[PDB]
């Protein structure tokens, strides 16, 4: 029922928690098989469940320090080589970097004056075409990407430095 991180997609430097809800960046690459679905360079992991229709919620507990980005990716997001982290590559995400919260628009990111984030509710609407993010304390709106999604969409998580984490909460 509830989402878990999919180890076969995870960049081999990531460490997934035993319960498959949490992700952080490790200090060494694990020796994992080089499956076509595995992100081999960018520090990403998908949930094991993707969505082709309907409306869906999940929540993400976020670290207080820099290094994370999360949201959704189109299934065709490129897995191999160093790729941009942009809407054009099929990534729609929030990010904590430089001590600021961002919606990762392109070519320039959009800084969010949202105050401190602890947990975020993600609302994916494949019927109308939107993904929205809310801070759970008061459900204040963080950002909405309006996208005419044309394929299956997966929850996406990325952690590119040590000292922070993301965790699915349900």
């Amino acid at each position: 029922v509830e989402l878990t991180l999919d180890p076969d997609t995870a960049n081999p430097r990531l460490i997934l928690s035993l319960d498959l809800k949490g992700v952080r960046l490790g200090e060494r690459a694990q020796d994992l098989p080089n499956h076509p679905c595995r992100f081999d360079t960018n520090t990403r992991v998908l949930a094991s469940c993707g969505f082709s229709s309907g409306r869906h919620h999940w929540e993400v507990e976020v670290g207080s320090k820099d290094g994370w980005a999360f949201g959704v990716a189109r299934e065709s997001v490129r897995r191999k080589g160093l790729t941009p982290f942009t809407p054009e590559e099929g990534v729609w995400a929030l990010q904590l970097n430089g001590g600021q919260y961002w919606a990762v628009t392109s070519p320039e990111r959009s800084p969010l004056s949202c105050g401190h984030l602890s947990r975020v509710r993600v609302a994916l609407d494949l019927e109308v075409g939107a993904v929205s993010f809310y801070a759970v304390e008061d459900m204040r709106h963080l950002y909405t990407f309006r996208v005419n999604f044309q394929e299956r969409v997966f929850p996406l998580f990325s952690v590119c430095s040590t000292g922070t984490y993301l965790r699915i909460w349900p």
Binding site: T43, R44, L82, N97
Partner: peptide, 5 residues
Amino acid sequence: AVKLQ
């Protein structure tokens, strides 16, 4: 390290 996000 954001290049690898």
